[PDB]
Amino acid sequence: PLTEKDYEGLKRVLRSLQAHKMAWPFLEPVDPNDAPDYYGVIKEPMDLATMEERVQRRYYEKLTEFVADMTKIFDNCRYYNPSDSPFYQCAEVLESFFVQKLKGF
């Protein structure tokens, strides 16, 4: 499974996404005042602060579980927003960055 060395890598990946200029819509759980009907559209929300809590609590047993949470952030964004939205493009850019960082493992 995941070792403590693995978790050091997970935290570094998470921090690199949190510092990215296009991560700002994903840093915290969506405030419904920022996204009308968001929680009527998105049935399984996820955000980077929730992922940080899960990393710190050693919630993940496998790398696939960490990657699934991250992918949910991007999939939720592209489902909720039209493809010409700046928010949708944030997900496209940040997922490309994330997938490249994952190759470093």
Ligand SMILES: CN(C)CCCOc1ccc(-c2cc(NCCCn3cccn3)nc(S(C)(=O)=O)n2)cc1
């Ligand atoms: C005041 N607040 C606590 C903190 C300051 C503002 O923080 C945010 C965070 C996320 C959004 C936002 C929006 C949106 N779709 C657009 C909905 C309509 N809209 C257009 C512009 C603003 N709202 N999709 C998404 S996402 C998570 O699917 O990419 N995230 C917006 C603001």
